[PDB]
Design a protein around this ligand. Sequence first.
Ligand SMILES: [Zn+2]
Ligand SMILES: [Zn+2]
Length: 232
Amino acid sequence: SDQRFGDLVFRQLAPNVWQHTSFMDVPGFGAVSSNGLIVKDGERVLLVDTAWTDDQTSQILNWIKQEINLPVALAVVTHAHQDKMGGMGALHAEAIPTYANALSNQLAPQEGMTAAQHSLTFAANGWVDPATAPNFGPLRVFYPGPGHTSDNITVGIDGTDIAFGGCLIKDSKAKSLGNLGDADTERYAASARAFGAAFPKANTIAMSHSAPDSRAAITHTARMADKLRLER
Ligand SMILES: [Zn+2]
Ligand SMILES: [Zn+2]
């Protein structure tokens, strides 16, 4: 099912939903992959994350024009890390409206990243403000709280069984919580469970550093963060 296109891999998770995977050689971590989503919303395309680099992101757009042949109406990025906003200049070069958490845009220059042109705000219940996320269609953006970072957001797709956890959620067989450098060890547990409650009917949990998994990935991440909470 994994379709190869250039330096990336593409997999169809559902009708109108695809997963794009880019690879990067972290020096002390081997060849680490990162996943994003491509959503066909009627006559337009919605992108849920970029690749590691500008070059890999332009390969994503070339795949969209090749396979779907529809304009990319908007692009959301889940937090300010290389695997998520590394291809921001590639999306801005094609005049694609980019959206991110307001904190992610404040943090992007601190890590050498191009901030998104629009900033998302959120209500007290973690859901995105409709004034900041216009015409998102099926995209349901949810802020579960500080976890993997302090700005990580999640996205769900209506009409589908799919909810995207980004780097907050790891697969049910993960032996660790991944990159904990920018993590909130206290709220990670409650944030992982908040993401599971925001999308209760989503049994296909997609994430950045793992293949799509069931909802056991949510509880396994929460239990892992439960022990991380008491170790700090
Ligand atoms: Zn990250
Ligand atoms: Zn990541």
